[PDB]
C-alpha cells in the first residue's frame, strides 16, 4: 500500500526499498549439473 497515492493494494516489491533490513537472501540447495564437458579421455596421451 502506497500512502498519498491514487492506487492502493499494489502487488510486487517496490523498486525503492527492495531489501528492508536484509543484505543477502541466502538460499541453500543441491544442484545437479549434467554437462557436455570438453575433455576426450585419459586417452590422447603417449602410451609410454
Amino acid at each position: 500500500k502506497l500512502t498519498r497515492t491514487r492506487l492502493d493494494r499494489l502487488y510486487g516489491l517496490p523498486a525503492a526499498d527492495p531489501n528492508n533490513g536484509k543484505e543477502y537472501y541466502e538460499i541453500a540447495g543441491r544442484f545437479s549439473l549434467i554437462s557436455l564437458v570438453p575433455s576426450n579421455d585419459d586417452y590422447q596421451t603417449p602410451i609410454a
Binding site: T45, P46, I47
Partner: protein, 48 residues
Amino acid sequence: ASLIYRQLLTNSYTVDLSDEIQEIGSTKSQNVTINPGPFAQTGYAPVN
C-alpha cells in the same frame, strides 16, 4: 681357405652396433593412443 666362413660366423656380433649407427642418425616417431570401439550416440534436447 675355409677361414672366411668361420670368421664371418664368429666376428658377427659387432654388427649389432651398426643398428645403433642407423638408429642414432634416424628420426623416430611416437603417437598417442586412439580412442577405440564405438561411440555413444547423443543428440540435442527437444526444441520449441
